[PDB]
Coordinates of C-alpha atoms and ligand atoms in Angstrom, one line a residue:
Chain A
X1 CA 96.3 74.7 62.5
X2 CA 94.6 73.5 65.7
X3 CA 94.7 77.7 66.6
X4 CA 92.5 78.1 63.1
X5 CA 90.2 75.6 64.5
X6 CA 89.9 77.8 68.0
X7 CA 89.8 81.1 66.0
X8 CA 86.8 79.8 64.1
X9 CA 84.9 78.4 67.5
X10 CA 85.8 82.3 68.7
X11 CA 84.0 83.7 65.6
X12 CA 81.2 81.6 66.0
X13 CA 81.3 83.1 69.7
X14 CA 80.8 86.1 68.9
X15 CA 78.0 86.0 66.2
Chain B
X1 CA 106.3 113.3 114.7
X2 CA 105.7 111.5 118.0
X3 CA 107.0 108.7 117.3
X4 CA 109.0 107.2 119.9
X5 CA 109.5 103.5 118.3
X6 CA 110.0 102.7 115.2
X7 CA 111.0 98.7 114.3
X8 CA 112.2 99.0 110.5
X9 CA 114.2 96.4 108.1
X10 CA 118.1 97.0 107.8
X11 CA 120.8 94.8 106.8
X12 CA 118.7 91.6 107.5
X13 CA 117.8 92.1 110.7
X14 CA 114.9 95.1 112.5
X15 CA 116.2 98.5 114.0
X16 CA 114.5 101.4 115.5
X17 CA 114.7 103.9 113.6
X18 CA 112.7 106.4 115.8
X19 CA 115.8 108.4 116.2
X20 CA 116.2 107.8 120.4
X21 CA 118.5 104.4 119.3
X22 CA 116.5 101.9 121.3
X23 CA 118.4 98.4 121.4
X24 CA 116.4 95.8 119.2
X25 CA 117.4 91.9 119.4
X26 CA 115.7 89.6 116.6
X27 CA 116.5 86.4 117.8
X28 CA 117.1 83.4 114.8
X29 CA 113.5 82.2 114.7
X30 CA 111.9 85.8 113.0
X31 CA 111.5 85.3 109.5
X32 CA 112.3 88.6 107.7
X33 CA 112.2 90.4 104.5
X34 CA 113.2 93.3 102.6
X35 CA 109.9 94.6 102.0
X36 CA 109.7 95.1 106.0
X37 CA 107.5 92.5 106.8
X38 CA 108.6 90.2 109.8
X39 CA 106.9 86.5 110.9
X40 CA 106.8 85.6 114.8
X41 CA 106.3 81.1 114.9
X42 CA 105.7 78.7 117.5
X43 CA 109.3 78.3 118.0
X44 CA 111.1 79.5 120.8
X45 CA 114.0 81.5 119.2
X46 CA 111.2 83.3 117.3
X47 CA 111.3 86.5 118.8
X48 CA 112.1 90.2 119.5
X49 CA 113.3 92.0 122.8
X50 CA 113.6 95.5 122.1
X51 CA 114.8 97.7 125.1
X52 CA 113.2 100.8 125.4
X53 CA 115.3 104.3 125.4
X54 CA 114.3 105.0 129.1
X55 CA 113.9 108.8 128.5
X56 CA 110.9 108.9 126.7
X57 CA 108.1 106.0 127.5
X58 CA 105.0 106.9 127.7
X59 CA 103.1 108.4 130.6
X60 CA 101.9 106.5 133.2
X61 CA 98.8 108.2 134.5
X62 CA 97.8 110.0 131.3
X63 CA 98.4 107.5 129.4
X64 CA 99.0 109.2 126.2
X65 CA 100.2 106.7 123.5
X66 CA 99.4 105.0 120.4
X67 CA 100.4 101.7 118.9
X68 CA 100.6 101.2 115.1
X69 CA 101.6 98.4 113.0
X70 CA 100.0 95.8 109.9
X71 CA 99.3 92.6 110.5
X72 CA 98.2 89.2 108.7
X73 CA 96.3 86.2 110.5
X74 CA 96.2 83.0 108.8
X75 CA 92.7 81.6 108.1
X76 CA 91.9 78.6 110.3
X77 CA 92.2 74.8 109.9
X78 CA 88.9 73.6 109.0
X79 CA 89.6 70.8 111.7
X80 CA 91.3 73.5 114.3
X81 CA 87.8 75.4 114.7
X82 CA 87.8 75.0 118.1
X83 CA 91.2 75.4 119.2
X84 CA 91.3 78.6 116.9
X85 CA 88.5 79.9 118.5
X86 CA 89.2 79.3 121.9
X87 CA 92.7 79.4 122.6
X88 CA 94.1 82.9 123.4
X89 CA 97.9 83.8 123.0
X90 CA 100.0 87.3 123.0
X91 CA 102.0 88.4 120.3
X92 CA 103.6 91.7 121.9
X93 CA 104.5 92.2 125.1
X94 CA 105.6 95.3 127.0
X95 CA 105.0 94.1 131.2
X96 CA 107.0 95.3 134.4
X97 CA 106.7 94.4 137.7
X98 CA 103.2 92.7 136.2
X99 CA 102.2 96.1 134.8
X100 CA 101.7 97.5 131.4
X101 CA 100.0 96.5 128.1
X102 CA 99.8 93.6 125.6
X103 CA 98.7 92.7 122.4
X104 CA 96.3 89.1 122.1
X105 CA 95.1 86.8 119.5
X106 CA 92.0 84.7 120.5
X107 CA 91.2 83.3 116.6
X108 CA 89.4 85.8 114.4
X109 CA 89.9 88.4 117.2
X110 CA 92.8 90.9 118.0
X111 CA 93.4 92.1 121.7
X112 CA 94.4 95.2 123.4
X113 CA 95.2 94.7 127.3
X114 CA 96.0 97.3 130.1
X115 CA 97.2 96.8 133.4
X116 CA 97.6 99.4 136.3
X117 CA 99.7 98.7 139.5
X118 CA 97.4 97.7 141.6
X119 CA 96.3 95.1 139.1
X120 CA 93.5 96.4 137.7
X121 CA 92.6 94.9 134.0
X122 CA 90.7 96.3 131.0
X123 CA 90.4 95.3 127.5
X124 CA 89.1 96.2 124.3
X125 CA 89.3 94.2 121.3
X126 CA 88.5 94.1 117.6
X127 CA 86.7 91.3 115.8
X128 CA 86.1 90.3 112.5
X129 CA 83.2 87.8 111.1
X130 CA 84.7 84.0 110.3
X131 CA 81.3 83.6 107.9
X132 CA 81.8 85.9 105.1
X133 CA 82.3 84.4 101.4
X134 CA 84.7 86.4 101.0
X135 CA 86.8 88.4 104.4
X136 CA 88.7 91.7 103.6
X137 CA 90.4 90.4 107.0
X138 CA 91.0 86.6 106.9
X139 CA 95.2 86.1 106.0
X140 CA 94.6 90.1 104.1
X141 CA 97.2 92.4 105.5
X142 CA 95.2 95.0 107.0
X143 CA 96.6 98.1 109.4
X144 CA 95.9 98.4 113.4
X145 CA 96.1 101.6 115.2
X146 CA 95.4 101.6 119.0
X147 CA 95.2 104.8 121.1
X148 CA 95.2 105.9 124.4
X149 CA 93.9 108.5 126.6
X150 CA 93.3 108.7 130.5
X151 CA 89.2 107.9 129.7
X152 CA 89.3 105.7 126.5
X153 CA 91.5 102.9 124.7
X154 CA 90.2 102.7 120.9
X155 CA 90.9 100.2 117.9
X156 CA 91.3 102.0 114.5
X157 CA 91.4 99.2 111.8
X158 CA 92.4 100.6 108.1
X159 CA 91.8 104.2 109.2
X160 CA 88.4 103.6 110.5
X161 CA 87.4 103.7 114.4
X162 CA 85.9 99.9 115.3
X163 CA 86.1 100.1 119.2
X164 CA 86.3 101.8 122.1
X165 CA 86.4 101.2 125.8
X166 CA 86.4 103.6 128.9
X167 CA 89.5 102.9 130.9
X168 CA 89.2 105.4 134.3
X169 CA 89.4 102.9 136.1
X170 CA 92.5 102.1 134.5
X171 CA 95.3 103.8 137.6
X172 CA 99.2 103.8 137.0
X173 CA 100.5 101.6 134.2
X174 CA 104.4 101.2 134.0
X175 CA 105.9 102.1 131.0
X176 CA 109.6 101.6 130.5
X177 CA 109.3 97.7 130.2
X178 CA 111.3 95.6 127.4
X179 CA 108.7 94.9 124.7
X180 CA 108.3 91.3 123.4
X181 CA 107.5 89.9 120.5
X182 CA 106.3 86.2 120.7
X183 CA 103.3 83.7 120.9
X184 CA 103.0 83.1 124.1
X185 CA 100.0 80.9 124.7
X186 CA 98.1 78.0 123.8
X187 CA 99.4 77.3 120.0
X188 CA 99.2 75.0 117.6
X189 CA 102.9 74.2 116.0
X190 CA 101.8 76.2 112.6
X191 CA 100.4 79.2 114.3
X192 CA 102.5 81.8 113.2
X193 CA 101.8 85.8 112.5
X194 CA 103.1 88.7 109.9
X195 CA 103.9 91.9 110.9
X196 CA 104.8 95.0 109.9
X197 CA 105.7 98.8 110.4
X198 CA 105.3 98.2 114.4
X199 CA 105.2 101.9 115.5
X200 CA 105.0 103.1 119.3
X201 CA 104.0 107.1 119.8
X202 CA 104.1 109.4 122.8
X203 CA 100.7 110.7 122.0
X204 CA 96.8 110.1 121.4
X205 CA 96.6 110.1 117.6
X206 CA 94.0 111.3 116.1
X207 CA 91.1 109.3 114.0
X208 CA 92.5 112.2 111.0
X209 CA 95.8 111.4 111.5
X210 CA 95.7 107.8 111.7
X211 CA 93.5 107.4 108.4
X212 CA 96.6 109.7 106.8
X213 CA 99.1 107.4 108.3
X214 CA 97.0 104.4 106.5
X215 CA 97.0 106.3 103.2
X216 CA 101.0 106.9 103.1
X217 CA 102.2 103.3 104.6
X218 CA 99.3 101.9 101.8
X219 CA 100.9 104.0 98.8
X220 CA 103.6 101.8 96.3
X221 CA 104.5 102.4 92.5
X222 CA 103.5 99.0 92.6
X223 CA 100.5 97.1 92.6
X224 CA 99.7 94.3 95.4
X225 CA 98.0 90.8 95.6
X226 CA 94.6 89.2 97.2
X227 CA 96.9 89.4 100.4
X228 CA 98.4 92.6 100.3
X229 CA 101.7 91.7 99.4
X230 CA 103.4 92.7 96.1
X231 CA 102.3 91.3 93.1
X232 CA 104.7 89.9 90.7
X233 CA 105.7 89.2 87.0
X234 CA 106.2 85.0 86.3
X235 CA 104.2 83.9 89.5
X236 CA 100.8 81.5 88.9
X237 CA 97.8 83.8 90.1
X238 CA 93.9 82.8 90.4
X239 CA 91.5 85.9 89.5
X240 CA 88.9 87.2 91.9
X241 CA 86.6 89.9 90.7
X242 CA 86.0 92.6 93.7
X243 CA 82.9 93.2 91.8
X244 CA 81.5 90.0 91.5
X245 CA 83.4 88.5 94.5
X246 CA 81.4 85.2 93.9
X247 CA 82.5 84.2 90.6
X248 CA 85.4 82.8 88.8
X249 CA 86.6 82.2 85.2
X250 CA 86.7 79.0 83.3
X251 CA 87.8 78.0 80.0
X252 CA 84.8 77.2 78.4
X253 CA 84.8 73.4 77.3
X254 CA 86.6 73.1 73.9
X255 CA 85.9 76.6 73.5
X256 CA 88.2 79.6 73.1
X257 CA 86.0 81.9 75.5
X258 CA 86.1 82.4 79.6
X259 CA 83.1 81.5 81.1
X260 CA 82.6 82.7 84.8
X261 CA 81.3 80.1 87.3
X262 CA 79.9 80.4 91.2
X263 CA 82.4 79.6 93.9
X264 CA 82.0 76.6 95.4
X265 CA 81.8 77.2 99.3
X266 CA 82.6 75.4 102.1
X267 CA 80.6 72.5 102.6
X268 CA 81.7 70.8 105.9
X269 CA 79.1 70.3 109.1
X270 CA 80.6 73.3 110.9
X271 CA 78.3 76.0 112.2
X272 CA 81.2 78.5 113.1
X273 CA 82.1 79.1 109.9
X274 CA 81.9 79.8 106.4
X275 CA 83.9 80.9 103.4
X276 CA 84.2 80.4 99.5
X277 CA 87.0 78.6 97.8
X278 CA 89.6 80.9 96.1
X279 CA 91.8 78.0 94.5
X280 CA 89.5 77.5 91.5
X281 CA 89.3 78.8 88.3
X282 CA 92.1 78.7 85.6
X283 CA 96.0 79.7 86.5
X284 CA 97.0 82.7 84.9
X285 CA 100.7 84.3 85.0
X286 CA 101.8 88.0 84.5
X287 CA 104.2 88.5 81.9
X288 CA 106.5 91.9 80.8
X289 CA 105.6 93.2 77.3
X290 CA 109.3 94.2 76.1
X291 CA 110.2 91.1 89.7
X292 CA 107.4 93.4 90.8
X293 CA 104.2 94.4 88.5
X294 CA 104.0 98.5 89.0
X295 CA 101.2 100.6 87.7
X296 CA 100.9 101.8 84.1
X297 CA 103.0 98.8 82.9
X298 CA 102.9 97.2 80.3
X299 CA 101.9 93.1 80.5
X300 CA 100.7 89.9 78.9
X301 CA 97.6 87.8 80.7
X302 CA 98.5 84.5 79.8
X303 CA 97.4 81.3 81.6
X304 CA 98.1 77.8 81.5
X305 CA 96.3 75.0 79.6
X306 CA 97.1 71.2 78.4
X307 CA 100.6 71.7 79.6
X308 CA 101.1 75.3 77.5
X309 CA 101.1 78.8 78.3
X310 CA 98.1 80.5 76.5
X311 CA 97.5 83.4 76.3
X312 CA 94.3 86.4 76.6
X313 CA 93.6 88.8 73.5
X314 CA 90.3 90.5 72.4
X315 CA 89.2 90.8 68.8
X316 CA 90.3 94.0 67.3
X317 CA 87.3 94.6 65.4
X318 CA 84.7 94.0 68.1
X319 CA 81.4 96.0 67.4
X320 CA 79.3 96.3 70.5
X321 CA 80.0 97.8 74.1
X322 CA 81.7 94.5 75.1
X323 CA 82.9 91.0 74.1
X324 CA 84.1 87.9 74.6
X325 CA 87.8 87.7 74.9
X326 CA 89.9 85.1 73.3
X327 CA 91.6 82.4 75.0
X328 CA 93.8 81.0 72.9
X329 CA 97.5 79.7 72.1
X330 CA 100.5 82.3 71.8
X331 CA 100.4 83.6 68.6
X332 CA 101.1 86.1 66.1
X333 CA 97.4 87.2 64.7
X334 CA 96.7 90.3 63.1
X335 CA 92.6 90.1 64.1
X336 CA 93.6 90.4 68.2
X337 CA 94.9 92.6 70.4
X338 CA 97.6 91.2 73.3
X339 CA 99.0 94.3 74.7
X340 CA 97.3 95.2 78.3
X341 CA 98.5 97.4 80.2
X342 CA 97.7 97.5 83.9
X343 CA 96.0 100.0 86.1
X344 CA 94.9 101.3 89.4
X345 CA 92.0 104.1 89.0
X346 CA 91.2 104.4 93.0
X347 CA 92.7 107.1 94.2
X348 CA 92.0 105.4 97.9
X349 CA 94.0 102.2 99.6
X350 CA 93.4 99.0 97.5
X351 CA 94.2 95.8 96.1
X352 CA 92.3 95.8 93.1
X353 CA 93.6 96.7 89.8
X354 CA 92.1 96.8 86.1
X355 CA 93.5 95.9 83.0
X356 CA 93.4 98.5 79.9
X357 CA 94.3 97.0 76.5
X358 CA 95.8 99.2 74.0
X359 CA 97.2 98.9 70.0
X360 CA 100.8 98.7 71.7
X361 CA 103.1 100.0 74.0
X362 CA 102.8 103.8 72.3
X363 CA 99.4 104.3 71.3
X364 CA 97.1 106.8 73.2
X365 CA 93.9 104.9 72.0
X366 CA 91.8 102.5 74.9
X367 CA 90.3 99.6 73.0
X368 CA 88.1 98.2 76.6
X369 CA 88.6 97.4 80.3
X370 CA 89.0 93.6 81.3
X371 CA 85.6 92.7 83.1
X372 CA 83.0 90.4 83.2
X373 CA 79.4 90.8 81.2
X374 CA 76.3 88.5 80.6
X375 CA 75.6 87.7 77.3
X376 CA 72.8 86.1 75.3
X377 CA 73.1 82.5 74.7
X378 CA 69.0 82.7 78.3
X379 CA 72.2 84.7 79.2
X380 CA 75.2 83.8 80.3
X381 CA 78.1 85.4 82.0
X382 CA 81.8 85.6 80.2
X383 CA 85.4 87.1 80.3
X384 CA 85.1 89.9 78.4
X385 CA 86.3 93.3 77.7
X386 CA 84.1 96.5 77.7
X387 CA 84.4 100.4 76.7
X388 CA 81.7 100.9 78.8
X389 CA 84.1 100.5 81.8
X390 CA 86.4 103.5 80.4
X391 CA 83.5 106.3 81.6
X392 CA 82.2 104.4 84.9
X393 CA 86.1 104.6 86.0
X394 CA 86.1 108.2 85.7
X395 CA 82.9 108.4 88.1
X396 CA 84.2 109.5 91.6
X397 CA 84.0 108.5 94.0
X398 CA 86.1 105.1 92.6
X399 CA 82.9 102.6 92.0
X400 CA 84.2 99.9 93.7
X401 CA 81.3 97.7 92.3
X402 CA 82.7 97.5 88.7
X403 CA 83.8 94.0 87.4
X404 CA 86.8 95.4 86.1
X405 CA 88.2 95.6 89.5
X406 CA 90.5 92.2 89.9
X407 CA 92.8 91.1 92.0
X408 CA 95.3 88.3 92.1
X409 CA 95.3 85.4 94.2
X410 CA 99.1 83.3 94.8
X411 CA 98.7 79.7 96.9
X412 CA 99.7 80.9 100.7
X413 CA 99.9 79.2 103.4
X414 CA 97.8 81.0 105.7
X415 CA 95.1 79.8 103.4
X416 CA 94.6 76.4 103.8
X417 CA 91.1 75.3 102.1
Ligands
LIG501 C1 71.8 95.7 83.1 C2 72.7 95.7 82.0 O1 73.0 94.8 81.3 N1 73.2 96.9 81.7 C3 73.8 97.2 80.5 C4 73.1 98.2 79.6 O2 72.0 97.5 79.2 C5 70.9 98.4 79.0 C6 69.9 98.3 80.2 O3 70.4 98.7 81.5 C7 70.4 99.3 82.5 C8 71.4 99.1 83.5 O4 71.1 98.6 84.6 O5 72.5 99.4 83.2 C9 69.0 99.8 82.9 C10 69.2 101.3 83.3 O6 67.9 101.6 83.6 C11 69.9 102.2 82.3 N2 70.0 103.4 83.1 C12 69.4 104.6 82.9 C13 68.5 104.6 81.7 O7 69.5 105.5 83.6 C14 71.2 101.5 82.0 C15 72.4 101.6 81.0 O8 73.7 101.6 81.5 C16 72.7 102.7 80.0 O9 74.1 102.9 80.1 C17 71.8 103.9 80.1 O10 70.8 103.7 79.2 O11 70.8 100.2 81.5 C18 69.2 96.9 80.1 O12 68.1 97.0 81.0 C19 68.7 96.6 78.7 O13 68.1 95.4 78.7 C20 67.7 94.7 77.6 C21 66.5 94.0 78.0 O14 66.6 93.6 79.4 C22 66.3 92.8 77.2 O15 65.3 92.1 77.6 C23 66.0 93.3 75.8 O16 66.2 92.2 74.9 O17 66.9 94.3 75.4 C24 67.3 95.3 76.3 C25 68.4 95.8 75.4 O18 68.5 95.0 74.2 O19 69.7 96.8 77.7 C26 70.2 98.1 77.7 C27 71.1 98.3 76.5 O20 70.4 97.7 75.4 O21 73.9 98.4 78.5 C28 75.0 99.1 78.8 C29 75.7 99.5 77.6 O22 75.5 100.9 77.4 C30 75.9 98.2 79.6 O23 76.2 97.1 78.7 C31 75.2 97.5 80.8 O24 75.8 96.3 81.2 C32 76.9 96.3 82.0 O25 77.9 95.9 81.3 C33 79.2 96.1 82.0 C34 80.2 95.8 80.9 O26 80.3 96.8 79.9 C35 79.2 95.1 83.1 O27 79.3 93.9 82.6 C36 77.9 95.1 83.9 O28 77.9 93.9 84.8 C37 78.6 93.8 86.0 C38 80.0 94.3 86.0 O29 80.8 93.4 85.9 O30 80.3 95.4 86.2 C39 78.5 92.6 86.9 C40 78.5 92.9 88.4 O31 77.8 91.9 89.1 C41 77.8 94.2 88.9 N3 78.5 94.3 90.2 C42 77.9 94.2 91.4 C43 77.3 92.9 91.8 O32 78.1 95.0 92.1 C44 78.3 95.2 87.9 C45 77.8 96.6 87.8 O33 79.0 97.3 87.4 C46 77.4 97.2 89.1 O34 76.2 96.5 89.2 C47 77.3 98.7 88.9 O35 78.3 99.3 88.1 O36 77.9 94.9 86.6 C48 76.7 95.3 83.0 O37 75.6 95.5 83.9
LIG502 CL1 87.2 92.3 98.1

């Protein structure tokens, strides 16, 4: 559940 | 082919394997491995006497012969800068009756020494800069090649002529001496020197030759480090980008994303030299996807951070010519890619490599190169991956300017920084 919280600060990376 | 020395690894000890069965004695304090390199130290035991098959030295007056061998210097203590640059020692000896040649060390510089009979001396040298952010030469194995003629004595380093003297005035130099290797000289306790593929010929090689030479003892299904020396699965490597040779890569701060950073350079008083740091940046380790890293295999990135082993994907979807990669735990994700597999487009001698990744260890499909791109934020510069890449590697001759060149830098400890 921590990953989920990196994924999303990825996502917002990328857009 | 003219080769009338040949020192080569065997059993755990070095043997000419020329074919004319000179005697070679490695004495306790030569450090050796299988991959034929050999270290001469300060101690006294560390050396080699190798007696020469007294049928077929070289000749005296026309002094037709050539030396070949690789070699790595440690970089200099940052407190030593004077005693490096001043204190001159040999490392190979071949004297009799006070006549021959040598091979010298003074610091950044690498020596080639004749003397005739009647005790006439001449040198000629190659040097390389001690200022450079970042050296091709400093603790890099790189390959010498010295020839000889009755008019000149020439330094070829990596294929490429760098000096030359005239040496008429050179007379009669004997040949049939044992040849040492040592450090003989002024040394510190931790000078020491690698070595490799020492090669004595009857004959004045040519520039043609010698770069051929350089191509064949360069080639290896494997791929090599910063240093020159093999690179390897489950070692800790820094990154270095041959294209951007002044940046690094940083996990961004509780962010997901590798940010790349300016090396910080050295910033003591000293006005003799100057380098960049290559310790920096995050740790990363080379894993198989199922020893030595070879070409076309098949890897993970991964890297360590908070006490874990991380690892580098990119986003399968990604829409535009490059993007951010993702740093990020080890994971099974449907939405990234962790498959790279590793690759060496330059068809000449090098040490960098570039990483391809793919769907999986079948697939024919190229998803991006691993390289480094500046993106809007201002801009700012990240780890990213790029299709762009995939058509500037076809471009011949090899662009060596591309950031997805990398190579790999191990702790060694002829770089002290
Ligand atoms: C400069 C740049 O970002 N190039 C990216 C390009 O962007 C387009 C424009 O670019 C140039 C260019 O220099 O490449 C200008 C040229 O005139 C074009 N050439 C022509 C027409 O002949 C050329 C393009 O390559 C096209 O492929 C051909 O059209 O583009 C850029 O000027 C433009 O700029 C912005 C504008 O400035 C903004 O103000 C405005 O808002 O918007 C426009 C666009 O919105 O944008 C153009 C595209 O829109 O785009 C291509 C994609 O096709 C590439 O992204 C290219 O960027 C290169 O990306 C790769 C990764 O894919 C690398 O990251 C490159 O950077 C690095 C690298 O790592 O390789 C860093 C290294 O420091 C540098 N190495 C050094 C120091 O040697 C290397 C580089 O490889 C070497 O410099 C040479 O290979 O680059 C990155 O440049
Ligand atoms: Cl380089």
């Amino acid at each position: 559940d921590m990953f989920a919280k990196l994924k999303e600060k990825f996502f917002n990376e990328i857009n | 082919n003219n080769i009338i020395l040949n020192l080569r690894y065997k059993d755990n000890n070095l043997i000419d394997l020329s074919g004319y069965g000179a005697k070679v004695e490695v004495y306790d304090g030569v450090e050796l491995n299988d991959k034929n390199q050999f270290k001469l130290t300060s101690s006294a035991n560390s050396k080699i006497r190798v007696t020469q098959n007294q049928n077929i030295i070289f000749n005296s007056v026309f002094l037709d012969f050539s030396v070949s061998f690789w070699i790595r210097i440690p970089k200099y203590k940052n407190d030593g800068i004077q005693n490096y640059i001043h204190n001159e020692y040999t490392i190979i000896n071949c004297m009799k009756n006070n006549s021959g040649w040598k091979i010298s060390i003074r610091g950044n510089r690498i020596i080639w020494t004749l003397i005739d009979i009647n005790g006439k001396t001449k040198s000629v040298f190659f040097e390389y800069n001690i200022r450079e952010d970042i050296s091709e030469y400093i603790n890099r194995w790189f390959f010498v090649t010295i020839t000889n003629n009755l008019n000149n004595a020439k330094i070829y380093i990596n294929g490429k002529l760098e000096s030359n003297t005239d040496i008429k005035d050179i007379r009669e130099v004997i040949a049939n001496g044992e040849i040492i290797f040592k450090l003989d000289g002024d040394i510190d306790r931790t000078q020491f020197i690698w070595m490799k593929y020492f090669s004595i010929f009857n004959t004045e090689l040519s520039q043609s030759n010698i770069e051929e030479r350089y191509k064949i003892q360069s080639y290896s299904e494997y791929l090599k480090d910063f240093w020159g020396n093999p690179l390897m699965y489950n070692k800790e490597y820094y990154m270095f980008n041959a294209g951007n040779k002044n940046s690094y890569i940083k996990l961004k701060k509780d962010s997901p994303v590798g940010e790349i950073l300016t090396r910080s350079k050295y910033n003591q008083n000293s006005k003799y030299i100057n380098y960049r740091d290559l310790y920096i940046g995050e740790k990363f380790i080379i894993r198989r996807k199922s020893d030595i890293v070879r070409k076309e295999d098949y890897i993970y990135l991964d890297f360590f951070n908070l006490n874990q082993e991380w690892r580098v994907y990119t986003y399968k979807y990604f829409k535009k010519e490059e993007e951010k990669l993702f740093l990020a735990p080890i994971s099974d994700s449907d939405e990234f890619y962790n498959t790279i597999q590793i690759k060496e487009y330059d068809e000449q001698p090098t040490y960098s490599c570039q990483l391809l990744f793919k769907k999986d260890e079948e697939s024919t499909d190229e998803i991006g190169l691993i390289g480094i791109h500046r993106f809007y934020e201002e801009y700012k510069d990240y780890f990213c991956i790029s299709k762009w890449y995939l058509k500037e590697v076809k471009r011949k001759p090899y662009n060596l300017k591309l950031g997805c060149n990398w190579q790999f830098i191990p702790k060694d400890e002829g770089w002290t920084e």
